[PDB]
Design a protein around this ligand. Sequence first.
Ligand SMILES: Nc1ncnc2c1ncn2[C@@H]1O[C@H](COP(=O)(O)OP(=O)(O)OP(=O)(O)O)[C@@H](O)[C@H]1O
Ligand SMILES: [Mg+2]
Length: 253
Amino acid sequence: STTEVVMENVTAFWEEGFGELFEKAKGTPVLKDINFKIERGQLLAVAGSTGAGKTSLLMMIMGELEPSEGKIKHSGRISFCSQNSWIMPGTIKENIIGVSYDEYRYRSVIKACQLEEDISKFAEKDNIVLITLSGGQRARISLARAVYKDADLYLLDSPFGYLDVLTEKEIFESCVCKLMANKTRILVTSKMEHLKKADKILILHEGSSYFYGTFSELQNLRPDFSSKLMSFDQFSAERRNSILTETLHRFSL
Ligand SMILES: Nc1ncnc2c1ncn2[C@@H]1O[C@H](COP(=O)(O)OP(=O)(O)OP(=O)(O)O)[C@@H](O)[C@H]1O
Ligand SMILES: [Mg+2]
């Protein structure tokens, strides 16, 4: 199954004392007046400047950060892919599946994340003990682990680190848009292509919603903003994020 996710007028503080004070009241919040609704099986793309609250938003959904105002609604299990890849000492297989094995699911995830060719290189195949991996292999294994988990909501925080432009595109398509096409998911990204293929987009800046709605509505309701951001996707993660950050500081509020 999958869930809908709804946030209505949500405000949150990481400093729990302040969150209580604000709540009771009938520094500055990490997230302010956040609103979105994603339907079952839909993709929300979340972009924004550095420190804007993109990971914090995900942490709220996981219950690590509580709102001081507003309503969050969602049900079921959550799977989370962090923006920092991590590999535990053990086999490639163990890293992806943990303890529970489903052959058909495991095979579809390795294919979707392009891990077949990485696995096949080794004598032991996926029983190879984690051999040091490249950043890109680490990113793909971390993604595979998150997508393999049977969950009702998938939270993918910038999962495409150290990938080539073309293979990030291939994996966005095969994994996020095809394998997970019927799962509710939220993707943090800085690629315009990802925003374009999303059902909904949320742009965050200093904890506020700079824009929520559709890519074509962004093109329409934010023409001056779009005109800077739209060969952007060939730029490095760092450069895209610096351009997005600087543009947001210019046009915010
Ligand atoms: N557990 C926490 N406790 C206190 N403050 C936090 C915590 N997590 C994040 N913050 C702070 O909240 C702000 C938002 O950080 P967050 O990680 O949500 O930003 P981000 O938009 O994901 O940025 P990036 O583009 O760097 O990933 C930052 O000032 C950060 O230092
Ligand atoms: Mg983050």
